[PDB]
Each structure stands twice: as C-alpha cells, then as structure tokens.
Amino acid sequence: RTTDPVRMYMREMGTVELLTREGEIDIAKRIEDGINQVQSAIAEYPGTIPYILEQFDRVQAEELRLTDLISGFVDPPELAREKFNELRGKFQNLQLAVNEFGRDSHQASEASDLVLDIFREFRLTPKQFDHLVETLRTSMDRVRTQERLVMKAVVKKSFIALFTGNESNEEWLDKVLASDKPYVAKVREQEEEIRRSIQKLQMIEQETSLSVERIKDISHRMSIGEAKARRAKKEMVEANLRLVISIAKKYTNRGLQFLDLIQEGNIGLMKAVDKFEYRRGYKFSTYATWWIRQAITRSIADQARTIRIPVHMIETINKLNRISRQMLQEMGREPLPEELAERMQMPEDKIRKVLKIAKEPISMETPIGDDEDSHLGDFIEDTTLELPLDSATATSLKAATRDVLAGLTPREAKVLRMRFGIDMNTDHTLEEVGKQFDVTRERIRQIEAKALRKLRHPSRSEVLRSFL
C-alpha cells in the first residue's frame, strides 16, 4: 500500500508493546543468566584455567595491564591478588585429585563444582572471553566435520548404537572390520581414510582429555546459553527501537537521511545493551540515549561530506560556529577572525585554516541562468590538455634537433643523444656513456663540452634559437 521504506519500518516496529521497569530487570537477568551459563560451560575445560593463571602470573609481576585481565568482581591488586592466589591453590588441589582418586570419584566432582562457583564470581573482559570461546568452537566444528565425513563415507544403525561411547574408540573400527555384511567391502576400503580421520581425532582428544560425551555436553550448554542471551538482547532492542527513532529525529537535514540515522542509532543501542548493567538501579533509557547520540554524531561526522573531515576538526568547526553565534548576538555584527582567535585561544592562522576547509562541494547541475537548460558543468575547462601549437612546436623542435645533430660526427652525436636521452627510453649519466668505448669519465665530459661549443656556432645554431 506504500512505497516509502520509512513507513514500513514504523509499521514493523509498532507491533511490539513498550516495556516497563520490571521487564527491563527481567531481560537483564536473562542476559546475565545466559552469560553465567556460558562462563560455567567454558570453565569446565582443562585448558581454560591455566591460561587465566598464567595471565595473572604475568600481571602480578607488573608486566601486563590489569584491565586486560579482569573487568570486575561479582559480589552477592588489593583484592584480586588474594582471589587469584585462592584460584591457583584450588587449581593445584584439583590437579592433584583430577585423576589419582578417579574421574568418577566424588572428590573430583566436588572440586569441579566449587571451581565453577569460584569462577562464577568473576567479570572477564570480552576480548579473551571470545578468545577462549573461539578455540572450543573450532574444536567442536572440526569434530563435526570429521563426524560428517565419516557419515558420508560409510553411507548406520550400528554407528548409532555405538555413537554414545565408541564414536572414536578403536572398538568401533575393530567391530567394523569384523562385520561381514555385503556392503562392508567398500567400508573396509574406506577404513584407511577412517583410520586417518581417527588418528587426527586422537590428538584433539588428548589435547582435551574429555573423549566425546563431555565436549558435546559443553557445546550444547554453551549453545543454549548463547541462544537465550541473544533472544533476551533482541527483545530488549526491539523494545527500544522507538527510543532510537525519537532520539534520531533531532539530527535531520545534516547531510544524512533519516533512515541512515535510525540505523546508526540502532547499532549504537545494540552496543549499549552489550554493556548495560542493572545492579546500578538506573533505567535503560538514560544509558541508551548517550550511545544512540554518539553513534549518530560519529556517523554524521564520518559520512555526511563528500570530502571527509576528521572528527577533531569537525569539533573545532562546531565550537567556532558556537562562539561565532555568541559573539554575533553579543556585539551585533559578524565577529572578525582576530576576535574569534582571541576568544578561542588559538592563533589566527589556525582559525583561518579551519574557516577555509569547512566547505561542501557544489553540484555540476546547478542551474546557471534564467533558462534551466544551462548548467555549471558545461562551463568547466580541461586544464590538463596540451595546446595544439605546443605539440607542433615539440615536433618542430625534434626535427630541428635532429637536423642540427646530423651535422656532427657519429661518436659525438651519439654521446650527446645518449647523454640527454634523445630517441631512447631512458637517460644516462657520464659513467655508462664512458662504458661504451672509453671508460674514463673526463673524456666524456670534454667531448660533451666540445658538442656544446660547436653547437653555439652561428652557422649551425640559428634554427634552434627561435624555439626560446
């Protein structure tokens, strides 16, 4: 019924009711729950804790930044040192009882659970958070690719029955070799590729020391947590879309269209929800307005001009405009550059430099004349062209130079020609001109001097004189 995308956009965002305070707290709690589940899932990894421990070891030695290690502490290096020492001690205790007392033993399970509880009281920077996420994601993806390659090669029921515990164990290979169904000949032929795949799998499993079930459970838990957090954040932004448009209205007609401003505000708001905190007790609108404002202003400063002006120079121009308006209101006339320089605490030259570079290039279809047919673009010359008389002069100069040099001795004319680069691609200095016959440089210089000496004889220099 409509063709303007703006109206369709408002139709689409108007279908969801507006949220209240309790809804905001509920969504924030869901986001925190998802983050906590993801952190707990990653913490159940033999390679995760050593990385944190060595990062703390480097940080405590006053060699690495403290902010890059952790970002906060959950409360239900005055304090970080004690907590990380406790974490190191518990890691030593767990490594002592990880396998000596038994994997299925209660000691290992209790130690792992309390390690999870301890690690839940931490707020890590998202950078190394995603760094640890990516490694396990890649491991899971490689396991999936190997499993799907095996599935494609073998193709069934026997694999499904033994998938729980013997997915990668050699018992499956032995039982396949023992099987004598009519289709097991090609399966036995493919067993070499399957052996290579499982050999590649052995390195991964010894790196993880979790077999197949444990990594599958960790991946499932992480996926559930991330999906729940994504749903919560998507709901939250879908709610705040109206705040985005309300804030973005105020900065129209600044070179950027309304929909682009709305999209930039949406991106800024997503960034805002990515770091929102509900324990502080402040509502979401106050925090989100700043991020939407910053996104809109950055987008305007970066994408509203044909010739891009850096952000700092944009701020300089804006402050100059504000002070100019204040002075214009105060004295009643346009403030001259010296006065603005004195007010702005900068030299006059900088003020003028700001003044000239604050222009927006004109269009080449601006109607120039009462009749609209004419435009500015058809009154623009091409300054890079060569005048035809100049080209004819160049040709005549080449001919005259050839005529003058033809009355000179072969060696001597060659010396001049291949010193000055006439009728050749490049120019040569005295050394390679000497390397022709007589390697000594001074003879080349003297013969060139003789060339010029005979070339300023009135008998053979009148034609070249007219070209000056």
Contact positions vs other proteins (CB under 8 A): 3-5, 8-9, 12-13, 230, 234, 237-238, 241, 255, 257, 259-260, 262-264, 266-267, 270, 303, 306-310, 313, 356-357, 359-366, 373, 376-377, 380, 384, 389, 392-393, 396, 400, 425-427, 462-463, 466-467
Nearest CB to other proteins, comparing residues 66 and 151 = 151
Which region holds residue 334: left if phi is over 0, alpha if psi is between -120 and 50, else beta? beta
Q: Which helix (H) or strand (E) holds 72?
A: strand 70-72
| Cα-Cα end-to-end distance for the chain | 75
Residue type, 133: V
Helix-helix angle 48-60:80-96, to 10 degrees: 140
Name residue, tokens 């009519």.
182
CB of 346 to other proteins, least distance (A): 17
Nearest CB to other proteins, comparing residues 50 and 255 = 255
Structural tokens at position 129: 């958070």
Nearest CB to other proteins, comparing residues 96 and 394 = 394
Nearest CB to other proteins, comparing residues 94 and 241 = 241
Structural tokens at position 78: 């005055």
CB of 344 to other proteins, least distance (A): 20
CB of 299 to other proteins, least distance (A): 9
Cα–Cα distance for residue pair 40/226, rounded to 1 Å = 12
CB of 362 to other proteins, least distance (A): 5
Cβ atoms within 10 A of the Cβ of 399, count?
A: 11
Cα–Cα distance for residue pair 273/284, rounded to 1 Å = 9
According to DSSP, the β-strands at 123-124 and 70-72 are antiparallel
- Nearest-CA neighbor of 378 among 386, 361, 360, 366? 366
Nearest CB to other proteins, comparing residues 329 and 466 = 466
Structural tokens at position 426: 């490049």
Nearest CB to other proteins, comparing residues 219 and 266 = 266
Structural tokens at position 91: 């890691």
- Nearest-CA neighbor of 39 among 94, 117, 97? 117
- Nearest-CA neighbor of 460 among 404, 378, 390? 404
Cα–Cα distance for residue pair 237/295, rounded to 1 Å = 15
Nearest CB to other proteins, comparing residues 65 and 359 = 359
Cα–Cα distance for residue pair 363/366, rounded to 1 Å = 6
For residues 33 and 254, the answer to whether their CB atoms sit within 8 Å is no
CB of 241 to other proteins, least distance (A): 8
Nearest CB to other proteins, comparing residues 24 and 264 = 264
Nearest CB to other proteins, comparing residues 330 and 381 = 381
Coil, strand or helix: which one is 71? Answer: strand
Cβ atoms within 10 A of the Cβ of 309, count?
A: 16
Cα–Cα distance for residue pair 59/149, rounded to 1 Å = 44
Nearest CB to other proteins, comparing residues 34 and 115 = 34
CB of 247 to other proteins, least distance (A): 16
CB of 303 to other proteins, least distance (A): 5
CB of 307 to other proteins, least distance (A): 5
Nearest CB to other proteins, comparing residues 178 and 389 = 389
Residue type, 284: F
CB of 170 to other proteins, least distance (A): 34
CB of 266 to other proteins, least distance (A): 5
Coil, strand or helix: which one is 119? Answer: helix
CB of 363 to other proteins, least distance (A): 6
Cα–Cα distance for residue pair 340/337, rounded to 1 Å = 5
